[model samples]
Target: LRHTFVVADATLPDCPLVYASEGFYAMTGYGPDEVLGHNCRFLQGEGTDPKEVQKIRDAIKKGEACSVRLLNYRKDGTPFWNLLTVTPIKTPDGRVSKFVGVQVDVTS
Candidate 1:
């Protein structure tokens, strides 16, 4: 119940954010307007692990679903642990059209 969902358009550069839920804003302290068209990497901070980023990338490239927990910062740079799962959305023709990013803050 504490999870937030976001949809990103794979066709866009770096899979820009397309649809973000209100739960997302509440979790990350960023309004939808601030992140709707931006890459999710904005939430990453100096503490973020590059290997985690690579993990997600590898999954996206394979059109697979993968989950990872990494250090992520809120809008004001408040660091928290984020359990993020990314899954590819495929079009009818079998090409990946979008990505659904799901995030859960387990620090509660």
Candidate 2:
């Protein structure tokens, strides 16, 4: 069950979440209805690292794959370490179609 993930629409203005796996609910305590169409940044909070955030932003802007470990908040405001990996999926025409982000809770 380690395949928890979310998909974002790259064609959209802000790359909003289009789909989330059930394992995501167990990890983030967010229902699909509550998080659909929202940016994954909703999981970030005060203690999240700005540098790491910028890394993700840069990767997205470049349409590249990125893997970073950063602090993220659950729906209940509990903090956890997330090893987040985002990969840009390109269409046949070579444009970015979507981004698939895999999330792993590494908090001990």
Candidate 3:
């Protein structure tokens, strides 16, 4: 299955993980517990592109959708190409309540 993860309560102080799907565990080799209350940046490493990271950061701050392909790391420190699409989920009041992150391994 394709990995799908959610960041609930994005307006929270730190914008923690809140929820990560089982498929995410398969892709990142991370335990379910390791994901909660953590930022997705844990998948990043020394060589991950800073420019791509910046683009994502900008979109998140503005509650906008942005897709970026970045070099990400697995639990074993192995590197792979990752295509991340982040979309903001709005509440009834039109405020961003959560963010949806869909990840794909694009290294082939």
Candidate 4:
């Protein structure tokens, strides 16, 4: 029932993972320091569907909001259902400056 959230600059080459709170660690088994310079894509593992990943990328590229339910792994390779919601954050100038993602662990 744990949840994790992150706000990141989508325009950055790495989609640099940022602003991951304590709950992010509890749910994804990744501490803040470990995730800071990396991309959230690191969370995907063997069971993660590539199609779903592509869907996310497509949505982000088009600046469209999307929600996906997919299998994702934790830092220790434990798999879980990831309910991911991604939204774009627009700057005052009307340009998207960042992307915010909310991840909910839905495994029973």
- Candidate 1: clashing residue pairs, number: 0
Task: Report the lDDT tens digits of candidate 4 across residue range 1-108.
Answer: 567789888778667877887888888888887888788888888888889999998988888888998898888888999999999898888778888998998887
Backbone atom clashes (below 3 Å) for every candidate: 0, 0, 0, 0
Better of 2 and 4 by TM-score: 2
Candidate 3: C-alpha RMSD to true structure equals 1.5
Off by over 4 Å in 1: none
Q: Tens digits of per-residue lDDT for model 3 on 10-92? A: 88855678887777888888887888888889999999999999999899889999999999999999998888999899989
Per-residue CA lDDT of model 1 for 1-108, tens digit only, reads 789999999987588998998889888889878898999989999999999989998998888999999899998889999999999989999999999988999877
> After superposing candidate 2, which stretches have Cα over 4 Å from the reference?
1-3
TM-score of each: 0.93, 0.95, 0.92, 0.91
Ranking by TM-score: 2, 1, 3, 4
After superposition, the stretches of candidate 4 with alpha carbons farther than 4 Å from their true spots are none
Instruction: Evaluate model 3: give its TM-score.
Output: 0.92
Q: lDDT per model, in order? A: 0.90, 0.92, 0.85, 0.85
- Spell out the clash pairs found in candidate 1: none
